[PDB]
Ligand binder design. Structure first.
Ligand SMILES: Nc1nc2c(ncn2[C@@H]2O[C@H](COP(=O)(O)OP(=O)(O)OP(=O)(O)O)[C@@H](O)[C@H]2O)c(=O)[nH]1
Ligand SMILES: Nc1nc2c(ncn2[C@@H]2O[C@H](COP(=O)(O)OP(=O)(O)OP(=O)(O)O)[C@@H](O)[C@H]2O)c(=O)[nH]1
Ligand SMILES: Nc1nc2c(ncn2[C@@H]2O[C@H](COP(=O)(O)OP(=O)(O)OP(=O)(O)O)[C@@H](O)[C@H]2O)c(=O)[nH]1
Lengths: 31, 427, 608, 438, 427
C-alpha cells in the first residue's frame, strides 16, 4: 500500500491546481 | 501567489462579514456545506486568492472574527454558513467592554491580542505573499474601534509592506444612540488618520434614503443594508479575482487616488438599483448606467459633494463592454461639469474594465470618489466634541480606566489639522 | 424509472444487521440506502427505499409487522429513522431528531414503543410511541465520566425495561410512564473494565450476557443488577465476540470477529460446537426457532446452518469492495465476470449464482475483459501486471509480470484475440502481442502523463480511443501506431464509448457532462449535462443507437435516448457510487455495479 | 580486457546502487529470472556484460561490485526485493552495528573484523576478473557509516594494489544544509585521510539536483527515485565508453592524467547538458550549441560554486549520438573565443573530448526525454575552494569550543588528529590560490 | 539483532506502561489473546525489537514492572491486557511504600535488588545484542524514584556500554499534593544527573492546558493523558522497528543532542492536535504541520521557552514525505528566527523520515528539543528546598530512616552547578 515508489500525490486536486505552483514563478508546474 | 486575509471587528462587523461572505460564496456557487458544484471555470481557477483548500473539495477561507459577546457569534454560527466558518477563527472574550472604547483599548485587549496575533501570524505564514488584508467594522463601534486601533498599530510594525483596507460604517448624524460615540469616534480617528491608507465612509441614514428611493419595500432589514454594502465590496474586490481588461491592483488604485498622504477617506458608489417594475422598465445601456452612477441621489456613502467639489474619481465597470462608451462618457462628464472639478490636476478619473458579468444581472459597476464631502461630517464631530469638553460629561469612567483629557486634546488638534488641510487644499 | 430485476450484495459491515421475520420465510437486511426482504424458498426480492443516505441499523417487530430502520448522515446533520409496514412493504413513518448517526434500534417486546441510540456526538437514547407518532422521551445515554455506549436491547418480558452497554458503560432503565420520564441505573462490574461488542437478553429475563471487545463473556443478573459470571476461564477468542445469540432452553451461540462460529454453555463456556468460517462474524439470527439459522460475515458471506449436524452452507455472497469493473461474454446474456479486491468472480446472471471464484492473494483489481471465443480471460492489476485465465476452469494461463510499474488501470483485448491495448497510471499505453505460450513487448507508448481510466477499441480493429486523468483523450492509429487525433477538455476524462457507425464518440469525464465529438475533423457535435450530482463513472451505448446509459456518483443509473438525447429511465437504490455499466447482448438488461459492491441487473424497459 | 569493479558503502549508497543496477539491467534488457530470452547472449562473461556482470555457463549474470552495509533493514529489504536472485547472497556484506555518524566508530570499532571479509571478496573477484581497469567508490562525506569504512578500506587497497585506479564519489556537505554537525568532523576526517592516497573524486549535491529538477523537470516533489536516476545516468554515460564503441575511445587513466595538472586536487565537477522534460523535448529541439551554452551555464553546475568567481584548469566533454566533428570544433572554438569562460594562462589547451555512437536509450518509469545527442562535462576550476573556506570557518569556532569531542575522546581518540586536519586543510586552500594565481 | 528491554516503575508508570503496551499492540495488529492476525509482514518481521515469541504464536513482552502494593498490579491484571504479561514478570513488594524517598531507597530495596537484578539479567541473556534500556516512572513518584535510583546504580557497574533512556514525569508546579515532593525530586535528580544519559520531560499541567485548548470534550481522564504521552513515546520508538530513509539509532540522535555530558533532559514536540471539527476542517500538509510543531501551544513539555533560546532540535516525520519539503521548512524557520536560535552553533536540526505511517492517520511527526525552559522549574524547586530545609520541616522521619543533613548540601550544590552551567552557556 505505502511501500510503493511510483509518484507522490499532490495534496490538492491539480485538476484545478489549487496549490498554484508556478514554473519557478514562470508558469504551470503540476504534471 | 498574492492573497488577502479578512478581519471582522466589532458587533456590526460581525453581521456585515457573514453577509459579505455568503455573497462571495453564492457568487462562487458552492453549497453551504462546502462541496462545490462545478459551473464556473474562471473562479474555479482564481479561488486561491481568497480561499484555502481542505481535503475532499472544501474551500477553507482566511479571516479572523473578534468580539467579546459569545451570543453574537453563536448567532452567526447558527447563520446559514456556520459550517463554512471556523472555530479555529472563533476567537473572543468572556465579557463585554461596556462599549467602552478605552476599556477595550487598554484593559480587555491586553489579554486577547496574544491569541489574535497568534492566529493572524499562523495565517500569514500559511499564506505565501499577501497583497495585504482588509478590516470590517464601525468607527462608532466601541469594541470595533478599540480593537481595530490596537491591531492595526501592531500589524503595521509587524508587516509594514502590505495593504490595509478599512471598511468602517459611519454612525447616523441625526441620532447616535450611544452618546459616548463622539468620544470613541474622535479617539479612534486620531490614530486612524496616522495609520490607515484606505477608508470607506458608509452611512445608515443614506442607506435608509436609498431604501425610500428605489428599494421602496417599506420594511427592510439591516441585513438588506448589509446586502447592499457587501455588493459594493464584492464589486471592488472582483477585479482581482477575475479576468478582464483592467489593472486590478488595489495598490495601483490607491496610488491613482493619492498625490498626498493625508487623503485617507473615500466614498463608495454602486451601480444599478431597481424597483419591482423597472426591471422591465429599464433598458441596459452604459449611458444610462453611468448617468445613474453619478447621481447625488445615487450618492450614498457619506453625503452630497454638491456643496463641495470632486477631487478624484475611480470608476470600475463590470460585464462585457467596449472602450468607446467609457471613453466618450468620461469626456461627456468632464465637459458637462469641467468647472465642478478642481484645476490642480485635470482628468482626475481612472476607469477599470472587468468583462465578467455578475450573477443575476449582466451590466454593473462600482465607483469610488474622494471629493470634498467630509467637511460636514468632521465639522459636526467638532461641534459635538467642543460642547462635550466644555464640561467633560461622562468622563469619570475614562478617568477610572486611567487615561486623561490630554489625549483628547491631541486628538482634537489632529482633527483640526484635518479640517485645515482639507479646506486649504480645496479652496 | 429504470426498473430492476436482479440484485447482488449485502452490507457485511453492519454488526447484527441480518434479521429474520417471524413468518420464518423472509430473510431481511439493509443494502446501503435500500432495504431488502428475501423469500427464503423462492428467492424473490423485495426492495424498499427513500432513504436519504445509506441505511445504518434496523430491527423487526416481534409480530414482524413493523420495520425500524435508520441511516447515517454527515456531521452537523440529522439522521433518519423509518418505520415500515411489512405486509404492505410500505413506508409507515419517518423521524429525524438525532444527529450524526444512529447505531441501535429496539422494538419493545409487545411492540409498544421504540428505542433509538444516537451517534457518539449525539450520545442520547430516545423512545418513541408508535400509537401517536412522536418520541416519548430521550436523554444523554451515559454519565459524563465514561466512554460511548454501543448496543441496546429490550427485556424479554417487559416493555418498560431495557439495557445498553459500550465503552465501560452498562446501564439499565425504567420507563416512568406517568411522568413520561427515564430512570437510569449503571451497574457494578468489580474491576473488569471492558467494552462491549455483542449483547443478548434471556428469553425468561433471568439474565443477560455480552461479548466484550476482549473476547470475554459477561453474565448478568438484572433484578439484583449484579454481575453473575464471566466468560471463558481461559481461551478467549480473537477479535472479540462480535455477535451473539441465546437459545430458548439455554446455551449461547457466539460469533467472533475471527470468523469463529461456536455454541457453548455457561457453567463452563467450554466450546461445545466449533466451525471456523470465512469472514469475521457480523450477524447471527435464528429461522423461527433456530433449528436452522443464519450468519453473515464482514466478507459479506451468508451461511445457513442446521444446529443438528453443525455444518454450514454458504448460500450467498458478493464482492465486499469497490468492484472496479465488470464484463460479459460477447453476444450472450447468461453470465459475466466481476473484478474486485482479493479476487475475480464469474457469475451466472439469471440465477445470480457465482459460477467461479479466483483466489487472489493480496491484491486489488482495476481492469478486466473477456476474450471473443469463450476460452480466455484477460485482466489488469494495480501491481502493474496482467493475467490470462481459462473460461470454465478459471486457471491461471499466464501472468504478464511487471506488465506495468505504477499499476494497470485500463485494459482492452482485440476482438481478433491477438493484441492487448492498455492504459496505465504512469501515462503509458502498451499494446502487446498475445499467445498461449509467449507474450512480448510490441511497444510501450508514452504520451499520457497521469492515470488512465477507460479504453475503447474500434470494431474495425484499426483505431482506439481512451479516457484518462489528464484531460486528454487520444484516438489512435492502431495500424500506423500513432495518435489519430486529440480531445482535450475542461475535464478529467474517465469513461468513453464509440458510435456504432463510429462517426460519433460519447464521453463523460469529470465535467459532469456527456459529450458527442465528431471523429472526422475535430469539431464538437453536442454537449449535455449528465450527472446532477457528481460524475458519470460508467456509460454503455446500444449496439444500434437506440439509447445509452450513464451513471456514477449521482447514484442514479440514467438511460438516455440517443435519437432524442433525453433521460429515458432512472434507477436508484445504488448506495455505492455507481461504477460501471454493462449491456446484456440481446438488449435485455443493464448491469450497474456500484462502489459498495452492489451489482444490479436492471430489466429492459423499452422494446428489444 | 575492459572491466572495472565498484564498491558501495552505507545505507546512503545502498538505494543509489540498487537503482543503478536497475538501470544496467534496463539497458541490457536483463530479465528478473536471471537469464536473457531466446536471444543468444550467454557465455562465460564476454559480451556487453563482460565489464558489468559475470554470467557463467549457468546463464546467470553476476555484477562486478560489492555492497558493505551496517544497517540490516535496507539490505534485507533489497534481499527481499526483485533482483535478489540476481544477487549473490553474501557479497551483500551486512553488519549488526552502526557507526553513529562517527568516522572513528566505523574506522576502529567494527571495521577490523569486516575489512578482512571485504578483502576476501576483493581477491575472489580479482581471480575471476581479467582487465579490471579500476574501482568505482560510492560513499558519502556526510557518511553516518559511509565515512570510516570507506577510509580504512581505501587505505588497505592503496597499500596492497598501488598500480591500478580507484575512482571516488560522495555526496558533498551542503553549503548551508546540515542534517548533522558531526558532518564537518567526519567529512574533514575522510578528506585528510584520503588526500595522500585518493586518486580522483567527483562530487555531487542533491540540493542542486532538486534545483535543476524543479528548474526544468516540472516535478515539485521528486525523490531519490529521480535523484538516483540522474546520478546513475551520469555514471552510465561515463561507462558507455566500456559498453559500446564510438568515434574515439577514452579511459579512466587518461581521465586521471589529463585531469591532473598538479597533485593534491583531484576533485572536479560534472554537469550534464541535455536535461529536459519529455513534452518540452517534444515541442523543442536539441543541438550542440545550446547544450554547450547550458553545460557552461553557471546554475547548470550541480555545485553552487560560481564560475565567474572561479578560474578553470581542466575540461573534458563527451557526447553520445550523431554529431559531426566540424560543428563540434566550431562550438569549442566559439567557447575559446568567449571571454566570460576563463582558463588560466598556464594552459593554452584545456579540453579533452570523447564521442560514442551509442545513444543512451530511455528507461521505463523514467522522467527524462528521448535523447539523440547528449554530453557530459567533467571540469576542474578554482571556484570550489569556497566550499572549503565555508567548512573551515564553520569548523574553527566549534573546534575552539570543543563541542561533542567528549564522545570521541571517551571512545578512544584525541585532538591531535583534529589539529593535523586543520593545517591539512589550510595547505589545500593555500595551494588552490597558489595555483589559481599566475 | 538489536533490541530494547523496558523498565516500568512507579505507581504512575503502572498506568503508563499499560497504556504503552496496549498502544504498541494496537499498532502491531495482535488480538488481546495474543494470536497474531497476519496483516503487516514488516512488523511481523521486526517484532523482535520488543517481544519474544513463545509457543503457539504469542510473543512475550520484554517489560519488567516493579511496585510495592498488590492492588496496583491487580487492577492492571483486571485491565484488558494483564493476561499478556507473566506472573513470572511480576516482581513487587511486601509492604507499604509510604511515598518516602529514603524508605524506598534504603530498607525495602535492600532485599528486592536481588530479585530485580536476577529478572533483568534473565531478560538480558534472553535477548542477544542490546542498544540499551528505557525506564518509565516519575521524579515526583516517591517509590519510582527510590527504586530507580538503586536499579540504575547497579546496572551502571553491570554494563556501562548501553543507552540508558529515562522517561519520568514531573509533578504539578502549581500544586505538588505531596508537600515533601521537593525532597523527593532533589534526592532523585542529584544522582540521576550523574547516572543517566537521556531523559524526557512532561508536565501534567501542560497536558491539562493542551486538553483545554484542543480536546474540548470537557472531561478527560489521566488515561487519556496516557494515551497522548504513550503516542509520543511510541512514535519516537518507531524508528528502529521501521524501514525508511531515517537513521533510527537513538545513539545516532543522542550524539547529535549532546555537546556536553551535563545535558540530559529533553522536551517533546508532537503532531496534529485535533478537535471536534478540525478533522474535516484540516488538510494534512507538511507546511502547516511544521507550523503547528513549532508553536508554543503545541510544545507541551514544561513551560514557555519564549524566555530563552534553543540549543538543539531533532524532528522526525512519519508517513509519506520527501527530503525537499522538510529541508525547505527547516530553512523557513531558520530564516524566520535566526535570532531565536543560538549563535554558538548553527544548524542544530536533526531530521528523520520514517516511511510507515501510523493507523488512523497518514502524516505524523515527533520532535525532541534541548533548550532553556527547565530553568524556571529547577529554580522553583531550589527555592522550595531552601524554604523547607531552612527549618528542617518533616525531618524526623528521614532521620529515623537513617539520613542526616549533610547530603542535602551537595544535592542542592549539584543543582546550582547545573543552574550555573546552563546559564553560563545560554548567556
Ligand atoms: N451588526 C449591526 N450593527 C448595528 C446595527 N445597527 C446599528 N449598528 C451599529 O454598529 C456599531 C458597531 O458595532 P461594534 O463595532 O461591534 O461596536 P462595539 O465595539 O461592540 O460597541 P457598540 O457600539 O456599543 O456595539 C454599533 O455601535 C451599532 O451602533 C445593526 O442592525 N446590526
Ligand atoms: N547517499 C544517500 N544519501 C542520502 C540518502 N537520503 C538522505 N541522504 C543524505 O545523505 C546522508 C547519509 O549519510 P549517513 O546517514 O551517514 O549514512 P551511513 O554512514 O551509512 O550511516 P547511517 O547513520 O545509519 O545512515 C544523510 O545525512 C542525508 O543527508 C540516500 O538515499 N542516499
Ligand atoms: N498512575 C497514575 N499516577 C498519577 C496520576 N496522577 C498523578 N500521578 C502521580 O504519579 C506519581 C508516580 O507514582 P509512583 O512513582 O508509583 O509514586 P510512589 O513512589 O509509589 O508514591 P506516591 O508518589 O506518593 O504515590 C505519583 O506520585 C502520583 O502523584 C494518575 O492519575 N495515575
Amino acid at each position: 500500500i505505502h511501500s510503493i515508489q511510483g509518484s507522490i500525490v499532490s495534496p490538492h486536486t491539480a485538476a484545478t491546481n489549487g496549490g498554484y505552483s508556478r514554473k519557478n514563478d514562470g508558469g504551470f508546474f503540476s504534471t | 501567489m498574492r492573497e488577502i486575509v479578512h478581519l471582522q471587528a466589532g458587533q456590526c462587523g460581525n453581521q456585515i462579514g457573514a453577509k459579505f461572505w455568503e455573497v462571495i460564496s453564492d457568487e462562487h456557487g458552492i453549497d453551504p456545506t462546502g462541496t462545490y458544484h462545478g459551473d464556473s471555470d474562471l473562479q474555479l481557477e482564481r479561488i486561491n486568492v481568497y480561499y484555502n483548500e481542505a481535503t475532499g473539495g472544501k474551500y477553507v477561507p482566511r479571516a479572523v472574527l473578534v468580539d467579546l459577546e459569545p451570543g453574537t457569534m453563536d448567532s452567526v454560527r447558527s447563520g446559514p454558513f456556520g459550517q463554512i466558518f471556523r472555530p479555529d477563527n472563533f476567537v473572543f472574550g468572556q465579557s463585554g467592554a461596556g462599549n467602552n472604547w478605552a476599556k477595550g483599548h487598554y484593559t480587555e485587549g491586553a489579554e486577547l491580542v496574544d491569541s489574535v496575533l497568534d492566529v493572524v501570524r499562523k495565517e500569514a505564514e500559511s499564506c505565501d505573499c499577501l497583497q495585504g488584508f482588509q478590516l470590517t467594522h464601525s468607527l462608532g463601534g466601541g469594541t470595533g474601534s478599540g480593537m481595530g486601533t490596537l491591531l492595526i498599530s501592531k500589524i503595521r510594525e509587524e508587516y509594514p509592506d502590505r495593504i490595509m483596507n478599512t471598511f468602517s460604517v459611519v454612525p447616523s448624524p441625526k441620532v447616535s444612540d450611544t452618546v459616548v460615540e463622539p468620544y470613541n469616534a474622535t479617539l479612534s480617528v486620531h490614530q486612524l488618520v496616522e495609520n490607515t491608507d484606505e477608508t470607506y465612509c458608509i452611512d445608515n441614514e443614506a442607506l435608509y434614503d436609498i431604501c425610500f428611493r428605489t428599494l421602496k419595500l417599506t420594511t427592510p432589514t439591516y441585513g438588506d443594508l448589509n446586502h447592499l454594502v457587501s455588493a459594493t465590496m464584492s464589486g471592488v474586490t472582483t477585479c482581482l479575482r477575475f479576468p478582464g481588461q483592467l489593472n486590478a491592483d488595489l495598490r495601483k488604485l490607491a496610488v491613482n487616488m493619492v498625490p498626498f498622504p493625508r487623503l485617507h477617506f473615500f466614498m463608495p458608489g454602486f451601480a444599478p438599483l431597481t424597483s419591482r417594475g423597472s426591471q422591465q422598465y429599464r433598458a441596459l445601456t452604459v449611458p444610462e448606467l453611468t448617468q445613474q452612477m453619478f447621481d447625488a441621489k445615487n450618492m450614498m456613502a457619506a453625503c452630497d459633494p454638491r456643496h463641495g467639489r470632486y477631487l478624484t474619481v475611480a470608476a470600475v465597470f463590470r460585464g462585457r463592454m467596449s472602450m468607446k462608451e467609457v471613453d466618450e462618457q468620461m469626456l461627456n462628464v468632464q465637459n458637462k461639469n469641467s468647472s465642478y472639478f478642481v484645476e490642480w490636476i485635470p482628468n482626475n478619473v481612472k476607469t477599470a474594465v472587468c468583462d465578467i458579468p455578475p450573477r443575476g444581472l449582466k451590466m454593473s459597476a462600482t465607483f469610488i470618489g474622494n471629493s470634498t464631502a467630509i467637511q460636514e461630517l468632521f465639522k459636526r464631530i467638532s461641534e459635538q466634541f467642543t460642547a462635550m469638553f466644555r464640561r467633560k460629561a461622562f468622563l469619570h469612567w475614562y478617568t477610572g480606566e486611567g487615561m486623561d483629557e490630554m489625549e483628547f486634546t491631541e486628538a482634537e488638534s489632529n482633527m483640526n489639522d484635518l479640517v485645515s488641510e482639507y479646506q486649504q487644499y480645496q479652496d | 424509472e429504470l426498473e430492476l430485476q436482479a440484485v447482488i450484495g449485502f452490507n457485511g459491515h453492519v454488526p447484527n444487521g441480518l434479521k429474520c421475520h417471524p413468518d420464518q420465510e423472509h430473510l431481511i437486511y439493509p443494502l446501503g440506502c435500500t432495504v431488502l426482504i428475501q423469500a427464503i424458498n423462492t428467492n424473490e426480492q423485495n426492495f424498499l427505499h427513500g432513504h436519504g443516505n445509506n441505511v445504518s441499523c434496523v430491527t423487526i417487530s416481534k409480530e414482524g409487522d413493523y420495520i425500524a430502520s435508520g441511516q447515517v448522515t454527515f456531521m452537523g446533520f440529522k439522521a433518519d429513522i423509518i418505520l415500515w409496514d411489512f405486509k404492505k412493504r410500505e413506508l409507515i413513518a419517518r423521524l429525524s431528531l438525532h444527529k450524526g448517526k444512529i447505531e441501535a434500534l429496539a422494538f419493545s417486546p409487545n411492540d409498544l414503543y421504540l428505542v433509538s441510540l444516537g451517534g457518539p456526538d449525539d450520545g442520547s437514547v430516545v423512545v418513541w410511541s408508535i400509537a401517536k407518532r412522536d418520541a416519548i422521551c430521550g436523554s444523554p445515554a451515559a454519565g459524563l465520566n465514561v466512554g460511548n455506549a454501543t448496543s441496546v436491547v429490550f427485556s424479554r418480558c417487559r416493555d418498560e425495561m431495557f439495557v445498553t452497554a459500550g465503552n465501560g458503560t452498562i446501564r439499565v432503565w425504567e420507563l416512568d410512564l406517568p411522568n413520561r420520564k427515564i430512570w437510569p441505573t449503571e451497574c457494578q462490574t468489580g474491576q473488569m473494565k471492558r467494552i462491549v461488542l455483542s449483547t443478548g437478553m434471556a428469553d425468561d429475563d433471568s439474565f443477560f450476557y455480552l461479548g466484550t471487545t476482549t473476547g470475554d463473556i459477561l453474565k448478568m443478573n438484572p433484578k439484583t443488577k449484579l454481575l453473575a459470571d464471566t466468560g471463558p476461564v481461559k481461551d478467549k477468542f480473537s477479535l472479540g465476540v462480535s455477535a451473539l445469540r441465546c437459545l430458548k432452553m439455554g446455551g449461547l451461540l457466539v460469533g467472533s470477529g475471527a470468523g469463529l462460529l461456536i455454541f457453548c454453555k455457561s457453567p463452563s463456556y467450554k466450546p461445545i460446537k466449533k466451525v471456523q468460517l470465512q469472514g469475521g462474524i457480523t450477524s447471527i439470527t435464528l429461522r423461527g426457532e433456530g433449528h436452522q439459522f443464519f450468519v453473515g460475515t464482514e466478507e459479506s458471506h451468508i451461511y445457513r446452518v442446521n444446529f443438528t449436524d453443525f455444518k454450514e452452507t454458504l448460500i450467498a455472497t458478493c464482492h465486499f469492495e469497490a468492484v472496479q469493473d465488470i464484463v460479459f461474454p460477447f453476444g450472450t446474456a447468461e453470465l459475466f465476470a466481476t473484478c474486485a479486491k482479493k479476487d475475480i468472480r464469474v457469475w451466472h446472471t439469471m440465477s445470480k449464482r457465482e459460477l467461479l471464484r479466483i483466489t487472489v492473494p493480496n491484491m486489488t483489481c482495476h481492469g478486466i475483459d473477456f476474450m471473443r471465443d469463450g476460452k480466455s480471460i484477460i485482466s489488469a492489476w494495480d501491481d502493474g501486471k496482467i493475467r490470462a485465465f481459462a473460461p470454465e476452469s478459471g486457471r491461471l494461463m499466464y501472468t504478464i509480470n511487471s506488465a506495468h510499474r505504477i499499476g494497470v488501470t485500463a485494459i482492452a483485448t482485440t476482438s481478433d484475440c491477438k493484441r492487448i491495448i492498455s492504459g496505465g497510471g504512469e501515462g503509458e499505453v502498451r499494446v502487446w502481442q498475445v499467445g498461449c505460450q509467449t507474450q512480448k513487448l510490441e511497444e510501450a507508448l508514452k504520451e499520457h502523463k497521469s492515470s488512465v481510466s477507460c479504453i475503447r477499441v474500434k470494431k474495425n480493429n484499426e483505431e482506439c480511443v481512451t479516457a484518462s486523468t489528464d484531460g486528454t483523450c487520444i484516438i489512435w492509429d492502431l495500424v500506423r501506431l500513432r495518435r489519430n487525433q486529440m480531445i482535450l477538455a475542461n475535464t478529467l476524462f474517465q469513461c468513453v464509448c464509440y458510435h456504432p457507425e463510429e462517426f460519433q464518440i460519447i464521453t463523460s469525464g469529470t465535467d459532469r457532462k456527456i459529450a458527442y465529438w465528431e471523429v472526422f475533423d475535430g469539431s464538437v457535435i453536442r454537449e449535455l449535462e449528465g450527472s446532477l450530482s457528481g460524475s458519470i463513472n460508467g456509460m454503455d451505448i446500444t449496439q444500434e443507437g437506440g439509447h445509452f446509459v450513464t451513471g456514477g456518483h449521482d447514484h442514479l443509473v440514467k438511460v438516455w435516448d440517443y435519437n432524442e438525447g433525453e433521460v429515458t429511465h432512472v434507477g436508484v437504490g445504488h448506495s455505492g457510487n455507481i461504477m460501471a455499466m454493462r449491456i446484456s447482448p440481446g438488449n435485455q438488461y443493464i448491469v450497474s455495479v456500484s462502489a459498495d459492491g452492489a451489482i444490479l441487473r436492471w430489466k429492459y424497459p423499452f422494446a428489444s | 580486457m575492459r572491466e572495472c569493479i565498484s564498491i558501495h558503502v552505507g545505507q546512503a549508497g545502498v538505494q543509489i546502487g540498487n537503482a543503478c543496477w536497475e538501470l544496467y539491467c534496463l539497458e541490457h534488457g536483463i530479465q528478473p529470472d536471471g537469464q536473457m530470452p531466446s536471444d543468444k547472449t550467454i557465455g562465460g562473461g564476454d559480451d556487453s556484460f563482460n565489464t558489468f556482470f559475470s554470467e557463467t555457463g549457468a546463464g546467470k549474470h553476476v555484477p562486478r561490485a560489492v555492497f558493505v552495509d551496517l544497517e540490516p533493514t535496507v539490505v534485507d529489504e533489497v534481499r527481499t526485493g526483485t533482483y535478489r536472485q540476481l544477487f549473490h547472497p553474501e557479497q551483500l556484506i551486512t553488519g549488526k552495528e552502526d557507526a553513529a555518524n562517527n568516522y572513528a566508530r566505523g574506522h576502529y570499532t567494527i571495521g577490523k573484523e569486516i575489512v578482512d571479509l571485504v578483502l576476501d571478496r576483493i581477491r575472489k573477484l580479482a581471480d575471476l576478473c581479467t582487465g579490471l581497469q579500476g574501482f568505482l567508490i560510492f560513499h558519502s562525506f556526510g557518511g553516518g557509516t559511509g565515512s570510516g569504512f570507506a577510509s580504512l578500506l581505501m587505505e588497505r587497497l592503496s597499500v596492497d594494489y598501488g598500480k591500478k585506479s580507484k575512482l571516488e564519489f560522495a555526496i558533498y556537505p551542503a553549503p548551508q544544509v546540515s542534517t548533522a554537525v558531526v558532518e564537518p568532523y567526519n567529512s574533514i576526517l575522510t578528506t585528510h585521510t584520503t588526500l595522500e592516497h585518493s586518486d580522483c573524486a567527483f562530487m555531487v549535491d542533491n540540493e542542486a539536483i532538486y534545483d535543476i529538477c524543479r528548474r526544468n523537470l516540472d516535478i515539485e516533489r521528486p525523490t531519490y527515485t529521480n535523484l538516483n536516476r540522474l546520478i546513475g545516468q551520469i555514471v552510465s554515460s561515463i561507462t558507455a565508453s566500456l559498453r559500446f564503441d564510438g568515434a574515439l575511445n577514452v579511459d579512466l587513466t587518461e581521465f586521471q592524467t589529463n585531469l591532473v595538472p598538479y597533485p593534491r586536487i583531484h576533485f572536479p565537477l560534472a554537469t550534464y547538458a541535455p536535461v529536459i522534460s519529455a513534452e518540452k523535448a517534444y515541442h523543442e529541439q536539441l543541438s550542440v550549441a545550446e547544450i554547450t551554452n547550458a553545460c557552461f551555464e553557471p546554475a547548470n553546475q550541480m555545485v553552487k560554486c560560481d564560475p565567474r568567481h572561479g578560474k578553470y584548469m581542466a575540461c573534458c566533454m563527451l557526447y553520445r549520438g550523431d554529431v559531426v566533428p566540424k560543428d563540434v570544433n566550431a562550438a569549442i572554438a566559439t567557447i575559446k573565443t568567449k571571454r566570460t569562460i576563463q582558463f588560466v594562462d598556464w594552459c593554452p589547451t584545456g579540453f579533452k573530448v570523447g564521442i560514442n555512437y551509442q545513444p543512451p536509450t530511455v528507461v521505463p518509469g523514467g522522467d527524462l526525454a528521448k535523447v539523440q545527442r547528449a554530453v557530459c562535462m567533467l571540469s576542474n576550476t578554482t571556484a570550489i575552494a569556497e566550499a572549503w573556506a565555508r567548512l573551515d570557518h564553520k569548523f574553527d569556532l566549534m573546534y575552539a569550543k570543543r563541542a561533542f569531542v567528549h564522545w570521541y575522546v571517551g571512545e578512544g581518540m584525541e585532538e591531535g588528529e583534529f589539529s593535523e586536519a586543520r593545517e591539512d586543510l589550510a595547505a589545500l586552500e593555500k595551494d588552490y590560490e597558489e595555483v589559481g594565481v599566475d
